[PDB]
Design a protein around this ligand. Structure first.
Ligand SMILES: Cc1cc(Nc2ccc(C)c(Cl)c2)[n+]2nc(Cc3ccccc3)[nH]c2n1
Ligand SMILES: Cc1cc(Nc2ccc(C)c(Cl)c2)[n+]2nc(Cc3ccccc3)[nH]c2n1
Ligand SMILES: Cc1cc(Nc2ccc(C)c(Cl)c2)[n+]2nc(Cc3ccccc3)[nH]c2n1
Lengths: 158, 158, 160, 160, 158, 160
């Protein structure tokens, strides 16, 4: 049984994240979508909210398990028995910072292999930050988010 | 009559911004220099100050209109009847984030065409952030700002 | 203002990404010259005559586009055409550094010509004529990336 | 899941960076095909027969690797091999834009094939087969970058 | 006597910084490791702490002098009689922002030549920010820091 | 310290950007060798003899520059010249990834040689010898980018 972890802040989870996790479930037996608490990022949604949103957004995928964590990423991957670490790559600016994290995760857990997947062209220019910025200005972001997430974001900003 | 919008935080407007807006006025009949309130960026100058500074800095250009806005960028462009959205491109790091905004603006207003212009080599390595950092340390930034802006920045920091 | 813009390239062959850019250009400028380089520098798959006819058929629906071959520097041609705008397509996969070099050099050669970067649809942001040709030459399906007339001419060229 | 992955390239010659990537791939997928392109497009230093034998000897210690030559598009070969994973090595010096083009094109040609980017050790993150060949051709020491069998074959090729 | 300045926030100084300063001492007669106060960055260590840490971390290098500063970087270089300004370059994302600072420093002090050095592959994927993030999550960062710095970081976070 | 630095390149032809870099290098090191690669690998516009004479005339005003041709790897030549500094120009349009590969490879070949990246004036940050040659070959004005002796020699070369 191959177990992969897809960690991130997911504040909130977008269609780009759904795309990545869906690709991951087609490749690995079990995928842990791991939501980092990330207090330094001052997230819009609490960890509990982010977990609830991602669980509903991924309920259609049978081999996904959504879990929150505040640990060091490498320790949490070891403790979940994961040997693959999934990250999405949309652009060059992502790639450079992604390399630092992957080399650090390799130093901390050499058997955890980092994998980068590329999202659909449809989601190649979006991010949670961008979607929140548009939504803060009352712009329509229904296209970019799961239904439950879009409702939660509208409600949070109301 | 072709109407172009050149939006930004302009905190404060620099010679690089003047270069871009001047190129835009040579290409389009009317240019709206649109200053975003941008409270999340915690700007050094108030929106009212930024508008006043840009109006004086662009007074020599007959077909420029300076306007502040707090709306979604795409809604403000529609409401100004603009069909061109101007942005400057100085480097690769700009380009990637510029692409996200342009694809988002296209989703929100498909008839608003994003245009990128390249500033003079003279202003290719400056930014409002960099000019403010130098000025906070009492470094001479007269070369990079319109006269009225340089006075305002010295006064603000005094 | 009655602006004349130039959209230069080798267009070997013209793709849906090029049609997207030129269409956007026609919505913002009064006259767009789709300027096809004679460029035997990197031996093109289609000859200049083929490239021009294909681009004319593929842009025939755009009333303010004129397709013209040129053999000089793109700035020398823009000057002779009285163009004041130079259209460059900026894909997510473009060599931005090259575009910077080109634009600063064009500005030195012809300061009255302004380089304007337009962005294609996300659909065409990850392709190039080079990639399309190599895929087609190596028996891959490129139908989606090309105008129908171009696809028919490309199949004919690869058959021989 | 019994995954079949493909790791394509020219492998002219196979380097320690390629061995690093294929080793990582064998730890995550059940079967990895190290797919060597016939590619006389940019006249390779080693012939296809040489490239295959070198890669077999250099990966002989990996039980789930199969070295196979191919002359078609990498997607046409992946399809015929029933591979659903395409391995790409991502060095700190890789052309990320090219990798994006390639992956989106491979996805168009074969949607059921997923591109997977793996990162080599920092030790091999700043090399390329091209750089290694040019250094070796110009009398520089490349012993550190190659498997011993490859280093012996490269010295033999440069001697003539 | 050629004098080079190697300025930075050094919050805290890492093995990557030690690598750069060591390369600089092999090339120039005297190297000033100059620690910027950087209050806008809200540093984890005080300037006094950062200076003490870097002095101990570089004590083995005879031609290094560690000095704190709050001045404009170019004025401090002039006042130290430096004619070379050293900066490390690990990646493309560094390079673009490094170019802006170097062109600004050249405008402010044309005789101060910026030099970029490349660290060892060993430290090409680390940064003070990354090391602090790992350490905040109790991850082992002994590999990336001088002994005295690692102790100070553990103590600061305890 | 009495440092010897090497500034290698093809210098085909030497431009104002190269003069800017070598001038900056002479202000920081005691002796700078402007090292001209014999490089017939990508058939140069000027021969090695032409490239050397042009670079000597163009740097004659710099007392601590020595112009020397070399045909070996840049590290093998730096070693034989007892250079401990390798100068690389970093333009805003440079291929940073290539510079990283090159520097890490030079460090492997000769650890005692330190790569030093210098930045040219903003005036020359968006040019390359390749761009200058292509513009000049295609009837564009490159006077601004070259030393006067180089401009005269380039016009003579293009006339034939
Ligand atoms: C200024 C300039 C440069 C140049 N080529 C070139 C060379 C080297 C570099 C490093 C760069 Cl950045 C560009 N061309 N090619 C042309 C003619 C042409 C037009 C359209 C497509 C193909 C050819 N016109 C022009 N004008
Ligand atoms: C989709 C595609 C493109 C392509 N070449 C290519 C062309 C142009 C661009 C601008 C890009 Cl991004 C790529 N090749 N080469 C192959 C065959 C092959 C496999 C492994 C190594 C060498 C050759 N297969 C394939 N498949
Ligand atoms: C280490 C090394 C590589 C190399 N060429 C090269 C090859 C491939 C890649 C991908 C890269 Cl990054 C570089 N050359 N060319 C030389 C000789 C020379 C000196 C100056 C200008 C031209 C030629 N010396 C050297 N040393």
């Amino acid at each position: 049984q191959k177990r992969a972890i897809y960690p991130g802040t997911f504040d909130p989870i977008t269609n780009g994240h759904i795309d990545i996790v869906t690709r991951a479930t087609q490749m690995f037996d079990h995928v842990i979508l791991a939501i980092a608490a990330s207090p330094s990022k001052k997230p819009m949604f609490t960890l509990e909210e982010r977990v609830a949103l991602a669980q509903q957004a991924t309920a259609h995928l049978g081999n996904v398990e959504v879990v929150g964590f505040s640990d060091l990423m490498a320790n949490f991957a070891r403790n979940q028995h994961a040997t693959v670490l999934i990250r999405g790559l949309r652009a060059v600016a992502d790639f450079e910072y992604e390399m630092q994290l992957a080399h650090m995760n390799r130093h901390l857990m050499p058997e955890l292999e980092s994998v980068f997947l590329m999202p659909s062209k449809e989601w190649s220019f979006i991010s949670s930050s961008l979607v929140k910025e548009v939504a803060r200005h009352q712009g329509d972001v229904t296209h970019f988010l799961p239904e439950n997430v879009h409702q939660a974001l509208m409600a949070k900003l109301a």
